[PDB]
C-alpha cells in the first residue's frame, strides 16, 4: 500500500522504525521479495511474516512509585504525600509522544515555617515596638491551620559603606543618630537573629532587645537579606518537609543589582551563604546586590514563598516587582505594622490557593504540553496552573511528552514538581530508538555474496563499494531496462 513507510527505501530496521511511529519491520527470510520489509504493522501479517519476528517497538509509560495521596499533614513526615505518581518510566520512539497524568493535593495541617525578615531603619521604630509580642499571637492564629508552626527572625538596613552610611564625625560611626540627640545601633547589612524554632516565646524574647539603625539614602538593602535568608539553610533552619514563608517587611524603596557600583562594589553576587558565626552577612561590603533572576532561581531551588508586606507608598512598586517573581504575593502593611498578623494569615491563604507546576532538567529533545483539570471536571487546555483552590483540594494535570529525533544518550531523566513543594514526579525517559536484532547481525556475512555485506536483521548491508540486494557486485554495471 501507499503507506508513509513505503515512500522511501529504508536500509534496514534501524531506519524503518525511524520513519514514523506506526512503521513496522519484518526480519524473516521467508518474506517475499515483492513485499517491502517496512510497512504498516497489519500489512506484514497479511503477508508471510512470523508475528514473533516483527519487532515493531511501541511506546509505554510505567508507574514505579504510586503511593496514595495523604489526608492530613500531621503524623509521620516520611509518609505525607502530596503528588502521585512519584516516579514513572517512559519508553518512546523517535518523534513519538505519550500522555500521563499527575495529581496534586495541598494537604491540610501541613507544617509551616515562617521567617520574619524586618527592616530596621529609623522609620521602623514604631513597627518594631508594635510587634514585640507577635510570637504568641501568631502561634494562636496559625493553630487553626497547622499544628507544627516554627518561626524565626532577622533584620537588615543596608550595606555599611559610603555613601549609604554616616561617617562624617568619628562618633557617627558608633551612634548614627547623634545629630538628632538620640542613640541607635551602628548600621548593619544583614543580621540573623533567631533560628526557626517552635518555642514561640523566644520570638518575643529576642525581638524585644532589637534596636533600629539609620542610613542616609532612601532605598534599602533588603534583597541582600532575602538572598542570604534563602541560601543559608543550616542557620535559618528551613525544614525539608514544611511550607516555607519568608515575610519581608519594609516601608522604603529597595536597592537593586548594579547599584553597588556607586559604593565601589563591582563583584556580582555569587548566591552563596556568607553568614558567619557572628550571624552577620560578612560579604555585605564586598558583593553587589543580587538580581531578580538570581533571587528567583534561589527561591525556586529552596522552595521558598516570599511575601512582600510593604506600606502603602511602595505597594505598587512591590506589586510590579512580584509580577516578575513567581510564587510571591504583596500585602499592605500599616505604618506601624499593627496588621502584620492578619496580613501573614491572608498571604498564607493565597499561597495555598494556587497550584503551579515547574519542570527541571528537561532534555532539549523533549517538549511538554499541559491540560489542567482545575476544580471540577472541566479542563482548561494549555495551562500548567490552576487557581481558586482551597487547602485540601485535589487537582489533576494531564501531560504529553514529545520527542525530537533520537538522542545518543538513552536515559535523560527529568523532574516535574509543583511550585513551592518538595514532593515531585521524576520521569525516567528511555529512548527506544534501536533494533534488538542488530546486536546479532552477522558481520561480513557469507549470507550475502562473498562476505560483501553484513546480514543486518535479515537483509544484506554492503560494506564499502559493494551494492545489490544480495551484495553481489562491487559496481553497477546495472540498467533498469
Amino acid at each position: 500500500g501507499p503507506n508513509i513507510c513505503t515512500t522511501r527505501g529504508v536500509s534496514s530496521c534501524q531506519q524503518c522504525l525511524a520513519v514514523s511511529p506506526m512503521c513496522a519491520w519484518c526480519s524473516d527470510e521467508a518474506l517475499p521479495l515483492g513485499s517491502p520489509r517496512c510497512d504498516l504493522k497489519e500489512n506484514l501479517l497479511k503477508d508471510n511474516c512470523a508475528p514473533e519476528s516483527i519487532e515493531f517497538p511501541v511506546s509505554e509509560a510505567r508507574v514505579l512509585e504510586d503511593r496514595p495521596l495523604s489526608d492530613k499533614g500531621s503524623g509521620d513526615s516520611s509518609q505525607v504525600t502530596q503528588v502521585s505518581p512519584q516516579r514513572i518510566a517512559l519508553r518512546l520512539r523517535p518523534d513519538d509522544s505519550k500522555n500521563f497524568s499527575i495529581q496534586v493535593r495541598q494537604v491540610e495541617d501541613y507544617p509551616v515555617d515562617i521567617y520574619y525578615l524586618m527592616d530596621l531603619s529609623y522609620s521602623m521604630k514604631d513597627d518594631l515596638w508594635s510587634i514585640q509580642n507577635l510570637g504568641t499571637k501568631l502561634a494562636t492564629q496559625m493553630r487553626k491551620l497547622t499544628s507544627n508552626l516554627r518561626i524565626g527572625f532577622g533584620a537588615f538596613v543596608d550595606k555599611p559603606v559610603s555613601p549609604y552610611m554616616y561617617i562624617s564625625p568619628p562618633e557617627a560611626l558608633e551612634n548614627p543618630c547623634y545629630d538628632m540627640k538620640t542613640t541607635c545601633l551602628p548600621m548593619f547589612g544583614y543580621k540573623h537573629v533567631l533560628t526557626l524554632t517552635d518555642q514561640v516565646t523566644r520570638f518575643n524574647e529576642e525581638v524585644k532587645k532589637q534596636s533600629v539603625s539609620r542610613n542616609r539614602d532612601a532605598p534599602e538593602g533588603g534583597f541582600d537579606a532575602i538572598m542570604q535568608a534563602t541560601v543559608c539553610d543550616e542557620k535559618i533552619g528551613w525544614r525539608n518537609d514544611a511550607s516555607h514563608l519568608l515575610v519581608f517587611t519594609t516601608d522604603a524603596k529597595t536597592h537593586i543589582a548594579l547599584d553597588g557600583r556607586l559604593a565601589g562594589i563591582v563583584q556580582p553576587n555569587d548566591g552563596q551563604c556568607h553568614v558567619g558565626s557572628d550571624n552577620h552577612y560578612s560579604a555585605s561590603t564586598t558583593m553587589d546586590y543580587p538580581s531578580l533572576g538570581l533571587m528567583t532561581e534561589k527561591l525556586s531551588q529552596k522552595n521558598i514563598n516570599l511575601i512582600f508586606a510593604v506600606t502603602e507608598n511602595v505597594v505598587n512598586l512591590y506589586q510590579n516587582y512580584s509580577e516578575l517573581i513567581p510564587g510571591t504575593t504583596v500585602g499592605v502593611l500599616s505604618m506601624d505594622s499593627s496588621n502584620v498578623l492578619q496580613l501573614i494569615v491572608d498571604a498564607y491563604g493565597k499561597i495555598r490557593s494556587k497550584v503551579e507546576l515547574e519542570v527541571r532538567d528537561l532534555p532539549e529533545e523533549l517538549s511538554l504540553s499541559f491540560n489542567a483539570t482545575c476544580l471540577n471536571n472541566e479542563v482548561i487546555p494549555g495551562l500548567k496552573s490552576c487557581m481558586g483552590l482551597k487547602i485540601g483540594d485535589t487537582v489533576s494535570f494531564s501531560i504529553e511528552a514529545k520527542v525530537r529525533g533520537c538522542p545518543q544518550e538513552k536515559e535523560k531523566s527529568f523532574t516535574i514538581k509543583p511550585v513551592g513543594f518538595k514532593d515531585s514526579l521524576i520521569v525516567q525517559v528511555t529512548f527506544d530508538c534501536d533494533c534488538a536484532c542488530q546486536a546479532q547481525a552477522e558481520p561480513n556475512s557469507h549470507r550475502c555474496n562473498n562476505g560483501n555485506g553484513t546480514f543486518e536483521c535479515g537483509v544484506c548491508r554492503c560494506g564499502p563499494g559493494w551494492l545489490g540486494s544480495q551484495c553481489e557486485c562491487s559496481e553497477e554495471d546495472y540498467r533498469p531496462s
Binding site: D217, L258, L262, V266, Q267, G293, L317, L324
Partner: protein, 592 residues
C-alpha cells in the same frame, strides 16, 4: 570578522583592578601612540595614601611596558592644623579615563573632602586634566552647595566624555538626593581658571542640570554619558543614562549641548532591568544622523516556555530626519551573562562603509570568563547576527575576570587603515589589544567556451597519439582588491576539478588534456586592483565506451585559497577574505 586572535596582553599589579577603564592616547606632538589603562585600586607612592589608584600609559610597540603617569604626587591637604581637607585614600582614581588629542581626563568618583563649613566626608569626586606639560585639577561638584540635598554626594566624574568643540561632559549620579546631575565646562575655562589655593572654583560658561521635585530622587542621572548631535546644529548634545528613573524602569535623557535644554527621553520596558547602564551614540547606518544604543544588562527574557530568564538586552534607535527614532532590540544569548554591560563603537571595523559596534557579556562564555560580540552595521540598521565572538582566556583568581567589562575602539594604533579594539579584564588585572586584519575582496570568474558538448565534434587531437577527441576550454579568472595597508601582489592557490557532483568514487566523464587528470592545481599571483587575470586549460570527454550516463550534466567547480603566510605584513598580521564573498564558484554545461 577580522579581529586577530594573537593579541597583545598587558598586565598590572595584582588586585589593582587594572583595566577597569581603557582608552587610547594619540598625542599630536609625536607619532607615538599609547594605551591608557585605569587601575582604581592600585597602591601609589602618594604620602600616606592607601589604594589611591592610578592611570598607566602603555606603549604598543617596543617591549609593551606599562608606566604610571603622574597626575598628582601629594597627600591630603590640610584645611587647618592637623585636620585634613581631603581624603584621597580609596578614592578610585582612574575609574574613568578619557582622552582627546593630547588632553587626558581622569576622575576619582569616590574622593571625599572636608567641607569648608563643617568637618565632613562628602564624596564630591574630583578629576585631573592633563594637556601636555601642565596639569590642573577639576572638581565642579566641590562647590559651596555642600550637603546631601545639594551636591555634596555628587560623586562627580563617575562618567565623562569629550565633545568635538573641546568641551567636557561630566556626570555625577549623587547630586540632589541622588537625582543625578550633568556638568559641562569648556576645556579652556578649566585650565585658565585653575588655582591651587581656591577649592570651589566658579566657571563662567558652565552648563549644569538643576534640581527637580522630590519625585525624581534616586534616579542616578549621569550613571553613563555619551555625546552626539541630535537636533542638527553641529553641536554635540548630551546623552545620559538614568537606570533607576521611572520606578526603576530605567530612562535615558538627551540634553541640548548649547543650553542644556531637554530634547528626548527613552523609557525601559521591564522593572529593575537597569535600562541605561551603558549608552553609546554612533552612526550605524551611513547617515549623518547618529544613533543611540542603550544597554539593559539585567533584562529578563521569556524563552520557548513561559519561564523568564536573565539574558540582557540592547536597544538600537536609529535617528530620523523628522526627529523620530526607529527602535529595535537585541537580546542576550546566555543566562546571567549580562549582555549589554559595555557598548563600544568601533568605527568602520572592516571599512565596509558603515560603522560597527561591539557589545560585551563579561560573565558569559564557557567557564564564565567573558564574551564580546562584534556586530556590523548595514544601510537598514544594525545586523542582528554577530559576525565574531571574542572569548576571555584567563581564569578567575578570586573574582570573575569580567573580560569585556570595559572596551574602547575607533582608533587605528598600528596605522594599517583599520581601527583596533582594547578590552579590559579588571577581574584578573589585564587589558588586551585586538588588531583588525586587512580585508581582501575577491571576484572569481569561470566559464567554458562551449555551453553544450556534442560528442560528434572531434576537432582536438589526443596528445601523444593520433586519436581525435571531443574537447572544450575552461577559462578561470581571479581579481582581488582591498583598502588599507596590503601587499601589492597576493598569491592564490587555484584548484580545479570537474564532474564534482557525481564524485562518489565512480567513473569521471571529463578530463584535462595535458595532465590526463580530472583535477588541476595552479599557484597564481595577482596584483591588487588590477584587471581580471585569466588562464585557460583544455579538457576533453572520454569515449562512449567508458561511461553510459548521458543525463547528468557535466559540472565545473572552482576553489581558490589565499596564501596568508606570505601576505602577512612585517608585524605578522595576516589579511582575511571578505565574509560574504563565496569561497567557490561553479558552472554547468550540458552533454548532447
Amino acid at each position: 570578522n577580522l579581529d586577530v586572535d594573537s593579541p597583545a596582553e598587558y598586565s598590572g599589579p595584582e588586585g589593582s583592578y587594572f583595566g577597569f577603564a581603557v582608552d587610547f592616547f594619540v598625542p599630536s606632538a609625536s607619532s607615538r601612540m599609547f594605551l591608557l589603562v585605569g587601575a582604581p585600586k592600585a597602591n601609589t607612592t602618594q604620602p600616606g595614601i592607601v589604594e589611591g589608584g592610578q592611570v598607566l600609559k602603555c606603549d604598543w610597540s617596543s617591549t609593551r611596558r606599562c608606566q604610571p603617569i603622574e597626575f598628582d604626587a601629594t597627600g591630603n591637604r590640610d584645611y587647618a592644623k592637623d585636620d585634613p581637607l581631603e581624603f584621597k585614600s580609596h578614592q578610585w582614581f582612574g575609574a574613568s579615563v578619557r582622552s582627546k588629542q593630547d588632553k587626558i581626563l581622569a576622575c576619582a568618583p569616590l574622593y571625599h573632602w572636608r567641607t569648608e563649613m563643617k568637618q565632613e566626608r562628602e564624596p564630591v569626586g574630583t578629576c585631573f586634566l592633563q594637556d601636555g606639560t601642565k596639569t590642573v585639577e577639576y572638581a565642579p561638584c566641590r562647590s559651596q552647595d555642600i550637603d546631601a540635598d545639594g551636591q555634596g554626594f555628587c560623586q562627580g566624574g563617575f562618567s565623562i566624555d569629550f565633545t568635538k568643540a573641546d568641551r567636557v561632559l561630566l556626570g555625577g549620579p549623587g547630586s540632589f538626593y541622588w537625582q543625578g546631575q550633568l556638568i559641562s565646562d569648556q576645556v579652556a575655562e578649566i585650565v585658565s581658571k585653575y588655582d591651587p589655593n581656591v577649592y570651589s572654583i566658579k566657571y563662567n560658561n558652565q552648563l549644569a542640570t538643576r534640581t527637580a521635585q522630590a519625585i525624581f530622587d534616586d534616579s542616578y542621572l549621569g550613571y553613563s554619558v555619551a555625546v552626539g548631535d541630535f537636533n542638527g546644529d553641529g553641536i554635540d548634545d548630551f546623552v545620559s543614562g538614568v537606570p533607576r528613573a521611572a520606578r526603576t524602569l530605567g530612562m535615558v535623557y538627551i540634553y541640548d549641548g548649547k543650553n542644556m535644554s531637554s530634547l528626548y527621553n527613552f523609557t525601559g520596558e521591564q522593572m529593575a532591568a537597569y535600562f541605561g547602564f551603558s549608552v553609546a551614540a554612533t552612526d550605524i547606518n551611513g547617515d549623518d544622523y547618529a544613533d543611540v544604543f542603550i544597554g539593559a544588562p539585567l533584562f529578563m527574557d521569556r524563552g520557548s516556555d513561559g519561564k523568564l530568564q536573565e539574558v540582557g538586552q540592547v536597544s538600537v534607535s536609529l535617528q530620523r530626519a523628522s526627529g523620530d527614532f526607529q527602535t529595535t532590540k537585541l537580546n542576550g544569548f546566555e543566562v546571567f551573562a549580562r549582555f549589554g554591560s559595555a557598548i563600544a563603537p568601533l568605527g568602520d571595523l572592516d571599512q565596509d562603509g558603515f560603522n560597527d559596534i561591539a557589545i560585551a557579556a563579561p560573565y558569559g562564555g564557557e567557564d564564565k570568563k567573558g564574551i564580546v560580540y562584534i556586530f556590523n552595521g548595514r544601510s537598514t540598521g544594525l545586523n542582528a547576527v554577530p559576525s565574531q565572538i571574542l572569548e576571555g582566556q584567563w581564569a578567575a583568581r578570586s573574582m570573575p575576570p569580567s573580560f569585556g567589562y570595559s572596551m574602547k575602539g575607533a582608533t587605528d594604533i598600528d596605522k594599517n587603515g583599520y581601527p583596533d579594539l582594547i578590552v579590559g579584564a579588571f577581574g584578573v588585572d589585564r587589558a588586551i589589544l585586538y588588531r583588525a586584519r586587512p580585508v581582501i575582496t575577491v571576484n572569481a570568474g569561470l566559464e567554458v567556451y562551449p555551453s553544450i558538448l556534442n560528442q560528434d565534434n572531434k576537432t582536438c587531437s589526443l596528445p601523444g597519439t593520433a586519436l581525435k577527441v571531443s574537447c572544450f576550454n575552461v577559462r578561470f579568472c581571479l581579481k582581488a582588491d582591498g583598502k588599507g595597508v596590503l601587499p601589492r601582489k597576493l598569491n592564490f592557490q587555484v584548484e580545479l576539478l570537474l564532474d564534482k557532483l557525481k564524485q562518489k568514487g565512480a567513473i569521471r566523464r571529463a578530463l584535462f588534456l595535458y595532465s590526463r587528470s580530472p583535477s588541476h592545481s595552479k599557484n597564481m599571483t595577482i596584483s591588487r586592483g588590477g584587471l581580471m587575470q585569466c588562464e585557460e586549460l583544455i579538457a576533453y570527454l572520454r569515449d562512449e565506451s567508458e561511461f553510459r550516463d548521458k543525463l547528468t550534466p557535466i559540472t565545473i567547480f572552482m576553489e581558490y585559497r589565499l596564501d596568508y603566510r606570505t601576505a602577512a605584513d612585517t608585524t605578522g598580521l595576516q589579511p582575511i577574505l571578505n565574509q560574504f564573498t563565496p569561497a567557490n564558484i561553479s558552472r554547468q554545461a550540458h552533454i548532447l
